[PDB]
Amino acid sequence: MQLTPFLILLRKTLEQLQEKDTGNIFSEPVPLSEVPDYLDHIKKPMDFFTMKQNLEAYRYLNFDDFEEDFNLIVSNCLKYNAKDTIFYRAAVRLREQGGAVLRQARRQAEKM
Ligand SMILES: CC(=O)c1c[nH]c2ccccc12
């Protein structure tokens, strides 16, 4: 299995996931200056910009590596934000719509 086609696939998949986050609330790290209690609750922050950096640093070499960080984006947001917020429901929506993107992309990776 070759590295370059796999990274091309992950780049495309990341772009498709970012397209689902229409408010761009997951595009960059949660601003810790605005939420000093965030790290009291969240052990490993994650966001799409950090994922892009990890991808280009060759830190994702299987689909699980990539999907685990996506799941952190979702789970951190569900954990930190109250159920009655836009942010919480945006993580639900991203889990649902992004899971579909991920299933098709993992299938492409399995074809490699
Ligand atoms: C994705 C997320 O939880 C957040 C994204 N931006 C934020 C700002 C304040 C509190 C939380 C957030």
Side-chain angles (χ1 to χ4, degrees), residues 30-39 80:
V30 173
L32 300 179
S33 59
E34 293 180 31
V35 274
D37 74 342
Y38 190 75
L39 298 181
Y80 184 75

Side-chain angles (χ1 to χ4, degrees), residues 7-42 44-54:
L7 298 177
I8 290 166
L9 172 64
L10 292 192
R11 291 183 187 107
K12 179 179 176 277
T13 305
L14 185 56
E15 291 180 346
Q16 290 166 333
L17 294 172
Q18 293 213 244
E19 286 178 22
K20 302 302 183 184
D21 167 27
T22 63
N24 294 324
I25 70 168
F26 308 112
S27 299
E28 295 180 344
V30 173
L32 300 179
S33 59
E34 293 180 31
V35 274
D37 74 342
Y38 190 75
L39 298 181
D40 301 343
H41 300 81
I42 302 306
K44 185 177 173 181
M46 188 53 56
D47 66 277
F48 285 132
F49 183 79
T50 301
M51 289 192 66
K52 176 64 167 174
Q53 300 180 307
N54 290 340

